[PDB]
Design a binder for this molecule. Sequence first.
Ligand code: 6QQ
Ligand code: MG
Ligand code: ZN
Length: 323
Amino acid sequence: NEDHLAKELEDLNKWGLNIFNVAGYSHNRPLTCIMYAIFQERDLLKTFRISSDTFITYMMTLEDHYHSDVAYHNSLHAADVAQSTHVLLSTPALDAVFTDLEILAAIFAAAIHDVDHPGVSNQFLINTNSELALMYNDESVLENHHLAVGFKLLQEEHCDIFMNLTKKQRQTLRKMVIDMVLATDMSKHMSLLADLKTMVETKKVTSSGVLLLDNYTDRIQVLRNMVHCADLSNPTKSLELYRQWTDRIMEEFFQQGDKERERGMEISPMCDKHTASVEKSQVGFIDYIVHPLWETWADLVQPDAQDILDTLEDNRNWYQSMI
Ligand SMILES: CC(=O)CCCOc1nc(Oc2ccc3c(c2)CO[B-]3(O)O)c(Cl)cc1C#N
Ligand SMILES: [Mg+2]
Ligand SMILES: [Zn+2]
């Protein structure tokens, strides 16, 4: 059990760590396990003076606020996005670019980015006049909610993992976490990608081949896009992992479609279990959203995302051939 978990964690810094196996060998606590592994690996507990007790207590409470009965948006997805963000932060083209605070903020943002997900989209909550949609004026409804829950849990007993940060560090980390979690709202996708394309068109590179960022706006725009990339990373993983993610998301999508049908609402795209094709949906999703994003990311950090983009294109063509 312990030796098996240790074997899986040999791939902690690698794309396509088997987070499903990590969940199995950690007794369904992948987020707490992988976050403790990541924080020890990066010396984040030492650097920001976080005790193991305080970190574990917060992470266990955070993981408890992910819904076990939802198929996709549970703590396994959060753990996957955190570990993928951890890998993207160590991409050679971004070496020595980001501060320790920015690294902390990105991994934390990824860990909390879907906390307390009900298993339905923003459009469902807007169209049903949900309390959450009312609270946030239909704007990034769930993403605002994820931030609210993630931050409020820091105020629980023995849970303030940012207690030993400076005042300016706490204020700046709050801003950056908000930016990165809000960047997972699909409504901001086209604007984020447009900014990413602009940075690629006007990128400054060193002799060693490292990206140069002049100001805070350029840094946060890359970090926003990084977490967005990590959130949309399932199709870029090895096919056996990607197929498992596809099974989970379609189960959650069909459950929303069932709720929409019984309420007498119009069923959302990819959510009608009677008519929808899993294979067509993935190919369409890759072509219009995931591939444009990752191709632009690959251009920013060239050649570091070459195998990732190749995997995305191979998985796209495989799924297309199964239509
Ligand atoms: C195996 C996969 O690749 C599933 C990706 C998630 O499935 C989709 N998500 C979409 O938009 C969101 C993307 C990210 C997130 C959410 C919605 C809510 O929370 B979240 O942060 O996880 C859209 Cl437009 C299409 C699909 C499809 N298929
Ligand atoms: Mg989300
Ligand atoms: Zn997500």
